[PDB]
Amino acid sequence: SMEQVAMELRLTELTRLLRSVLDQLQDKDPARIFAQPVSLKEVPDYLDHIKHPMDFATMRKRLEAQGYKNLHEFEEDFDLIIDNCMKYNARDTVFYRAAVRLRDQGGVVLRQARREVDSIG
After folding, report:
1. Is CATH 1.20.920.10 the right assignment for the domain spanning 1-121?
2. Where is this gene product found?
3. Taking the CB of residue 24, how many other CB atoms lie within 10 A of it?
4. DSSP secondary-structure letter at 90?
């Protein structure tokens, strides 16, 4: 149907905007601490601690399959990145501190993304 196409075009355009958002958030992680999944070879107990692991590569795979229907879904995954790290790692660690800085800096980006998603529809 033509309606299904229109909906698909909207999803494609959201995907375009979320790609730009993802790029901007990942620049706030210049140490690449959150770039890839935590290695279960190197942290074999991780899944005993963290039930829903997340990282920027995993988000990018979902994004490119147009797997985010709305901004809320995308933000859920970004918050997992931050929140997983702040639980597994202690306050005094470069990991925790990296997450805090990512959260604070990403807030700005996400605030305007929300306005754009609402604005363009």
Report:
1. yes
2. Nucleus; Chromosome
3. 16
4. -
What one-letter code names the amino acid at 97?
R
- CA 4 vs CA 9, 64, 68: distances in Å: 9, 19, 17
Broken C–N links (> 2.5 Å) in the chain, after residues: none
Q: Enter the tokens of residue 102.
A: 């990512």
Q: Are 82 and 102 in contact (CB under 8 A)?
A: yes
φ and ψ at residue 92, rounded to 5 degrees = -85, 15
What DSSP line would sit under 18-84, residue for residue?
HHHHHHHHHHT-TT-TTSSPPPTTTSTTHHHH-SS---HHHHHHHHHTT--SSHHHHHHHHHHHHHH
Q: How far apart are CA 57 and CA 6, in angstroms?
A: 29
Q: CB-based burial of residue 56 (10 Å sphere; 0-12 exposed, 13-18 middle, 19+ buried)?
A: buried
Name the experimental technique: X-ray
Residue 26 structure tokens = 């990942």
Q: What is the resolution of this structure in A?
A: 1.6
